[PDB]
Symmetry: C3
Subunit: 340 residues, 3 copies
């Protein structure tokens, strides 16, 4: 909500309270999304200040507050800062920002990250260029310096992040994306490569000294219709765990496919139909293994711009004999969202 | 404070900074409330959006920020999300919400949870239906579908919560309350029963496979006068700890009594007089033991609706020979509260 | 930003998103400030309510959200409540507040805590009266009861804080400051002494049963010019660690000197030049050791009151043979700040 706007500075304080619950059989250990209370809330700010007609400064922070913890010991479980960055936009020259933000490859994966509760399986956090990552300096250009309507690009510099965990770490790397949008149509290509850390290399699964990720996207966005498709691959970037051996590391290679079709009815109902499949190749020991594989049927109903509810249903296609131990059961999410 | 209100949506951002300090002798280990700095702050939001004349959506989140930690390692100690839920209200049909909220039995205990700093000893957190609990779906009806002024009820469904701790866990259960309010008078009856988890059953104290809690309340609220009384009992629900053996579990049974009398002077002074007593029965090994037992004298002075100060004084009646080791010393709380 | 102001109560919700990065060679283990992503954000509130013409109530909370953590396990690292207190101001009688706030000696050290990213080396947190501390009751008088323009003082009572760590703990103590400001000039003298806890005394470094800290300040603040100087000493208060022995405790004695010169150009550029030096004396085993020692060259450029960027550069004078193991490398901070 725009709670402030004076002297060229306007702050928008925003957030939401999400009553959320997952239904899956058993202890949801073997299901797709788990089972039980998954309620949570968000709070963040987006500020923008007009330094002059061409120059704009801005910043943004968003935090995630789990609503399913006890006020006991586990109280902080799941809590985190999702985004935190500041930057400047200058006329038709482009924008630049730095801090915790979205890796460039997400410029592609964004296309299909549209399901009501699930979806976007490949956009992992603290995983190089696919989801939010800390320490990214991002330059973005729109309409090619104002000379080409619809042509945009971005280059992104990832600063080394040596965390206590191979999964949450990264070396330096560069990434970039180009996309073009012409009347309801949009196409994107994004790519990034980075160094792996000593610890990432000390892991049992995956072999290499460089991590890679690229994805292409295609979309048709107009007339209440949203159809999107993504395809990408990765090298030693996708984190995987052998539930049997309790071994961990990164997939040597993956080929990912995401499809999403949705329609927005005038009365507020947005039915969704999607398909996701990510398969690892050359996993040391297993060979080829599916990591994600399912159909999605779901629907969101918007009471208005502040209230909505939805049922997301995962028809898991992974089979009970999956070598990594990836879960094979279905999961049904039901939620009620208020937001401002 | 109502920081936003446009297009049928109004957000109220609220909070407070509480400078608080406890005075009790010794290391306050043997006192009622402890001793020392207990300063803390709250921040939360309450949103409400009119979907149409009969339909209302809403959500609420509140967080607790301890103000007595070091910015060092212990920095997060005590911090937590207290409430987080979203829901809808429809004409005279009733409201429904889900998320972290107040158990239904609190509809009763609320009556006496009115002391300046202490009080409400039996409304424990993450303890089934008595205080805030995660995963509760709540239906509330007012004025009996609009057919009976003053008659309200609620039914509440508790979703199983399997935490690492028997104290912060719960199985599925149902609860309900009915209350009636007629001109300054109000009476309530609330009740809930739930399954106990394996871990709750693996505990040394308390024996059963079902937890119970019910409380009745009576009040007179009018003419600057507030008098309230509560009585309730519980079965295997009240958490207790043997400080000697360092044993823990739940009381097999408790009988709780709460009394509160207060008066609001025109100039801002609200003196308080209360009495609390909770006694456990059949505790494995000890027999009958008092858990809480004291008199309360306190006063709050309101400078206005945003500023106030108060002195709460506990005249602990527990005696030094209490078998569980419950503290016997007095505690005096002094506070200064700013809020918006 | 002043998001609320009605009925004599005005709330100011404030904060900032700071994209920040440190450049230092090696793994920055041996540098002054470290190396890498240091992005973070702040969020806080300052409320003020006019109880009547002479009486004002107020409160303030500020939190620090690290923007360089993974949403993984380390997610909360660095997060903390910086300030949290409530109080009252009465006509020309003075103000009083309690909670987590700034120790009185900071009334002095504030003078030089003006560098773009570094500086203020001696104003340690949870370290008695020099930085923020929990449990402080503070009385402040301005213009000597309204009888002496420019003459102010404060007395501050520190409540014992027994934390799990000798570094984050403290016993009871009193502190006070007096300062005088006459047309661009200002002079301050501050002092505080407190009891040390058993644990603080159980430490390997430093010897005594009372902690002391005093600092004097001098400043010239006018005409786009800011020149400030501080000098102070301490007894068993300054925390130190022997990186070789991994031993810790407090310096028996320190003599601290801070100098800062800055100029604000009309177009937004504020160049900074500073010098800091803190040296420990009588450290058990080492003798005299420098703790901090460097020159600072830096500059801040204000695009406006909401946006700015800066480069802080530490020319570390500490030498590679420093007995405690204090780092000797340079550090360059670059930041981009949005704020409201
Ligand atoms: C505003 C500060 C920006 C700092 C960017 C640092 C980038 C470091 O490594 C990039 C490797 O690619
Ligand atoms: C909006 C989602 C509501 C989900 C309610 C689940 C209740 C589960 O168990 C209740 C047992 O009583
Ligand atoms: C509003 C409560 C103020 C409580 C102040 C307690 C101070 C305790 O010890 C001070 C020692 O000096």
């Amino acid at each position: 909500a725009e709670i402030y706007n004076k002297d060229g500075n306007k702050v928008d304080l925003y957030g939401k309270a999400v009553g959320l619950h997952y239904f899956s059989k058993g202890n949801g250990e073997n299901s797709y999304g788990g089972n039980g209370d998954m309620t949570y809330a968000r709070l963040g700010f987006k500020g923008e200040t007009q330094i002059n007609s061409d120059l704009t400064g801005y910043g943004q922070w968003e935090y995630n507050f789990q609503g399913n913890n006890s006020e006991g010991a586990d109280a902080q479980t799941g809590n985190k800062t999702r985004l935190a960055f500041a930057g400047l936009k200058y006329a038709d020259v482009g924008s630049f920002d730095y801090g915790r933000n979205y890796g460039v490859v997400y410029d592609a994966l964004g296309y299909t990250d549209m399901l009501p509760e699930f979806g976007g399986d490949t956009a992992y956090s603290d995983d190089f260029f696919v989801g939010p990552v800390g320490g990214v300096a991002t330059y973005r250009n729109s309409n090619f310096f104002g000379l080409v309507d619809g042509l945009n690009f971005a280059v992104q510099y990832l600063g080394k992040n040596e965390r206590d965990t191979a999964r949450r770490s990264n070396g330096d790397g560069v990434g970039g994306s180009i996309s073009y949008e012409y009347e309801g149509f949009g196409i994107v290509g994004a790519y990034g490569a980075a160094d792996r850390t000593n610890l990432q290399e000390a892991q049992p699964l995956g072999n290499g000294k460089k991590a890679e990720q690229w994805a292409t996207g295609l979309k048709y966005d107009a007339n209440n219709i949203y159809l999107a498709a993504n395809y990408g691959e990765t090298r030693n970037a996708t984190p995987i765990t052998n539930k049997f051996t309790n071994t961990s590391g990164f997939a040597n290679k993956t080929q990912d496919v995401l499809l999403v079709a949705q329609y927005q009815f005038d009365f507020g109902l947005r039915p969704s139909i999607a398909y996701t499949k990510s398969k690892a190749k050359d996993v040391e020991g297993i060979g080829d293994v599916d990591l994600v594989n399912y159909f999605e049927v779901g629907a969101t109903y918007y009471f208005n711009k502040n209230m909505s509810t939805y049922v997301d249903y995962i028809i898991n296609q992974i089979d009970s004999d999956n070598k990594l131990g990836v879960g094979s059961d279905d999961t049904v999410a039901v939620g009620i969202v208020y937001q401002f």
